[PDB]
């Protein structure tokens, strides 16, 4: 996260770290959506251009964390993966369309002050809140600048951007399964996700019911915090029927 701040304790209790077993290193962010299901970006698990194709036994999820590198004894919980599910129409060849994946845990995680699931949006919450100018929140342990790493989880609030501005900022083909967020050059304020924040959540706090909803997944960008560029996020609600099909079937 570039130009963010340190998270407060328990500020993002749905935050998940995707962790490689060997070598031991951070792979991505993710989010907790129930006691057994974790949501992330498909490109965190499968990206053939970079020879990335992880299997369940390659990975762990670490839940309840604040510190990036410490083993947070008596606070964090580490879970093994039972199964990965990648969206069947995830487009790794072109533009990361439908950049979404689910991970089922081998055993349910116990909720605590530090571990708690986020809501997924319904149609009405998405329609009401996914509007240009409305701000969401992005969290992660990724890089602090494009070209180092944070001691603790970072947080930045960013406004959703008008779709024509998103489209006009890039040569990559944008789809309805994406939205973009970030400040414009003339707005002064700054901030973005960066490498290592992939797969983590873009959340909004509903003013109707005072609950946090995950509207996006950190998906892609061109650099980090560049003027005139914006971060792109998987549109969770647009893919929710697939999420529900997977959870209901498995």
């Amino acid at each position: 996260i570039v130009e963010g701040s340190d998270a407060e304790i328990g500020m993002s209790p749905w935050q998940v770290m995707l962790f490689r077993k060997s070598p031991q290193e951070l792979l991505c962010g993710a989010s907790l959506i129930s006691d057994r299901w974790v949501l992330t970006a498909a490109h965190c698990l499968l990206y053939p251009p970079w020879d990335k194709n992880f299997t369940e036994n390659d990975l762990l999820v670490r839940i309840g964390k604040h510190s990036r590198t410490r083993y947070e004894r008596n606070i964090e919980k580490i879970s093994m993966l039972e199964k990965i599910y990648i969206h069947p129409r995830y487009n790794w060849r072109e533009n990361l369309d439908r950049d979404i994946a689910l991970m089922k845990l081998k055993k349910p995680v116990a909720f605590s002050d530090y571990i708690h699931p986020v809501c997924l949006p319904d149609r009405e919450t998405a329609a009401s809140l996914l509007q240009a100018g409305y701000k969401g929140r992005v969290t992660g342990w990724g890089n602090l600048k494009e070209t180092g790493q944070p001691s603790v989880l970072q947080v930045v609030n960013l406004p959703i951007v008008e779709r024509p501005v998103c489209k006009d900022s890039t040569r990559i083909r944008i789809t309805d399964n994406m939205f973009c967020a970030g400040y414009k050059p003339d707005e002064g304020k700054r901030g973005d996700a960066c490498e290592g924040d992939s797969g983590g959540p873009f959340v909004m706090k509903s003013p109707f019911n005072n609950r946090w909803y995950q509207m996006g997944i950190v998906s892609w960008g061109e650099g980090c915090d560049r003027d005139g560029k914006y971060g792109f996020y998987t549109h969770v609600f647009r893919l929710k029927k697939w999420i529900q099909k997977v959870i209901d079937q498995f």
Binding site: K21, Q24, E25, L26, L60, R62, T69, R70, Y71, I78, M80, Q149
Partner: peptide
């Protein structure tokens, strides 16, 4: 720079 995690999670 990651602190080693308990071996039980790597079995």
């Amino acid at each position: 720079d990651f602190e080693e995690i308990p071996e039980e999670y790597l079995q």
